[PDB]
Amino acid sequence: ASMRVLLAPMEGVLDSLVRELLTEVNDYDLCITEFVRVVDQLLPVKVFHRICPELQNASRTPSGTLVRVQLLGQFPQWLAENAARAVELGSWGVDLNCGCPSKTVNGSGGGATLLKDPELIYQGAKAMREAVPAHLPVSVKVRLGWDSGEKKFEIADAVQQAGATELVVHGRTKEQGYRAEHIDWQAIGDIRQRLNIPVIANGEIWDWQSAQQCMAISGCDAVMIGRGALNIPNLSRVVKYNEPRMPWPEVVALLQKYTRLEKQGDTGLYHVARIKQWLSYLRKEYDEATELFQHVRVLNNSPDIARAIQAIDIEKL
């Protein structure tokens, strides 16, 4: 019966602005921030506030949905220091990225690179668990492996043995990328059966039926949705309650609200890039988004795209 739905971390997509917009019209149980890249220093407080403005609102979006800071990096001492800082600043626990393809800085790997030696996941997660007060959660997000799923149980074991609270599994290897035909929710179930912490299933959940299938196959009562949450802006309610997808006119209203939200540190091109990007996702689902994208793709500045989006009369749609 009960179902948890998490909004995925998405670097360069799901910032605080889009989290604000989406959580207002959804029932997400938790959102994950874009990653804070940890190398070999304690990051200043402003980095956390930039990535997670919700820290100044008791770790919640304006509508009240919890948000959790994610770290990306390798060195245990520095993951620990930065985890402690995230929670000192108010984060509801802390998450560790072990699934994103990521550039190594000097000797400091991160993300999917850690899947090549599961011990790196154990050491990083353990140092975070030890640094974060015991009542607050420490989560880890993984893929099934690097170039195969052969180490998928070692990866899962590393997270549990580190004392992590919960595990998100993206049901593909790194080398399988985002290829739909390679999703393996069964592998997620096999991991769940071995563990004693909640497993949150992730990958290729787009609608009510796909979530039902995912839960049935994996045995997980918790899922995480990333790209689908942009394609269908009310996807949490689609998945939880089998409600219809957000009508297009309400999608346009959402885009209009986005054009009126200010972005901290914006040089001037934020809305141009981000409205085009969101439309590039929406065209997978909404015919109308393909047409609107053709109209706005030629605009090269935020005021022009703001005027264009705002000009649309949603009562005429």
Ligand X SMILES: Cc1cc2nc3c(=O)[nH]c(=O)nc-3n(C[C@H](O)[C@H](O)[C@H](O)COP(=O)(O)O)c2cc1C
Question: Which residues are designated catalytic?
Answer: 100
Nearest distance, CB of residue 243 and ligand X, angstroms: 19
Q: Give the C-alpha separation, 205 to 198, whole Å.
A: 18
Cβ contacts of 76 within 8 Å, gap of 6 or more: 123, 124, 126, 127
Q: Does 253 bind ligand X (CB under 6 A)?
A: no
Residue appearing with tokens 């985890």 = 83
Nearest distance, CB of residue 93 and ligand X, angstroms: 15
Phi, psi of 216 (to 5 degrees): -65, -45
Q: State yes or no: 10 annotated in a binding site.
A: yes
Nearest distance, CB of residue 134 and ligand X, angstroms: 24
| Cβ-closest position to ligand X | 226
Q: Does 99 bind ligand X (CB under 6 A)?
A: yes
Of the ranges 11-19, 231-239, 280-288, 302-310, which one interacts with ligand X (CB under 6 A)?
Answer: 11-19
Report residue 102 as tokens. Answer: 């990521």
Report residue 71 as tokens. Answer: 């770290």
Angle at 81 between CA 77 and CA 85, to 5 degrees: 165
Of the ranges 20-28, 49-57, 219-227, 249-257, which one interacts with ligand X (CB under 6 A)?
Answer: 219-227
* Residue 72 β-bridge partners: 37
Residue appearing with tokens 């269908």 = 232
* Residue 68 β-bridge partners: 32
Report residue 317 as tokens. Answer: 């749609």
Q: Give the C-alpha separation, 190 to 201, whole Å.
A: 12
Q: State yes or no: 163 annotated in a binding site.
A: no
Judged by CB under 6 A, the residue of 5, 10, 127, 232 near ligand X is 10
Nearest distance, CB of residue 229 and ligand X, angstroms: 7
Q: Does 170 bind ligand X (CB under 6 A)?
A: yes
Q: State yes or no: 9 annotated in a binding site.
A: yes
Nearest distance, CB of residue 109 and ligand X, angstroms: 14
Report residue 127 as tokens. Answer: 């140092």
Judged by CB under 6 A, the residue of 202, 210, 231, 236 near ligand X is 202
Q: Does 171 bind ligand X (CB under 6 A)?
A: no
Q: Does 37 bind ligand X (CB under 6 A)?
A: no
Using alpha carbons, select from 48, 55, 15 the residue that is nearest to residue 270.
15
Footprint on this chain of ligand X (rule: CB under 6 A) = 8-13, 34-35, 70, 97, 99-100, 141, 170, 202-205, 225-228
Q: Can you say which residues are annotated as belonging to the binding site for FMN?
A: 9-11, 70, 141, 202-204, 226-227
